[PDB]
Amino acid sequence: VPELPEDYEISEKTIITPIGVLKSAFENNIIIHATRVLKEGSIFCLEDRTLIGMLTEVFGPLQNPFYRIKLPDSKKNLFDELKVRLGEKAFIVT
Amino acid sequence: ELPEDYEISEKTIITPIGVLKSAFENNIIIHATVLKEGSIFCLEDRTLIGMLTEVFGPLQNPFYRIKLPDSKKNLFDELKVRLGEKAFIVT
């Protein structure tokens, strides 16, 4: 599985592409509801380039998938921050 | 798809199955701690969650997704508020 350093920040230049809506946060999982050309290892972020993390699992029906991003323990602070931002548009870095 | 008048009768065997962890977009997510296709989930007071719609997650610690229909919005809102409670499987 793949993991993201802490000082990794999405540069303000890079292209960001809308992908879905942050819908859920439990147990260090972040759930995004699909709304868009995705990879293994694609990185999700919010519009302000707050980095969410890397795709862990795709589930739900093919038409409107749900994406699950599992954060590691070291990323608890980030989890709590996202927990509180449910409903914001999520994006996939390219 | 369950009828309206359907409630779990207090007489029926219930079985712990996981913990209610999440509710969004009419889905209820349960974290596992036998199950059949078409098994009914409920809480310990027999409050009906609904019928299994999807098994995902890793094989060791699955998650269960129950999609409720629009007509059961009131029940979603009630379950939304009850996160963390033990879930059970009817038998």
Curated annotation (Swiss-Prot), chain B:
Subunit structure: During assembly of the complex, component of the small nucleolar ribonucleoprotein particles containing H/ACA-type snoRNAs (H/ACA snoRNPs) which contains CBF5, NAF1, NHP2 and NOP10 proteins. Interacts with SHQ1. Interacts directly with CBF5. Interacts with hyperphosphorylated C-terminal domain (CTD) of RNA polymerase II large subunit (RPB1).
More about this protein: Present with 1810 molecules/cell in log phase SD medium.
Region spans: RNA-binding: 43-91
Subcellular localization, as worded in the UniProt entry: Nucleus
Residues of the whole record sequence present: 124 to 220 of 492
Protein name, per record: H/ACA ribonucleoprotein complex non-core subunit NAF1
Domain notes: The central region (136-221) reveals a striking structural homology with the core domain of GAR1.
Gene this protein is translated from: NAF1
Signal peptide location: none
Family: Belongs to the NAF1 family.
Function: RNA-binding protein required for the maturation of box H/ACA snoRNPs complex and ribosome biogenesis. During assembly of the H/ACA snoRNPs complex, it associates with the complex and disappears during maturation of the complex and is replaced by GAR1 to yield mature H/ACA snoRNPs complex. Acts as a competitive binder for CBF5 probably required to prevent non-cognate RNAs from being loaded during transport of the particle by inducing a non-productive conformation of CBF5.
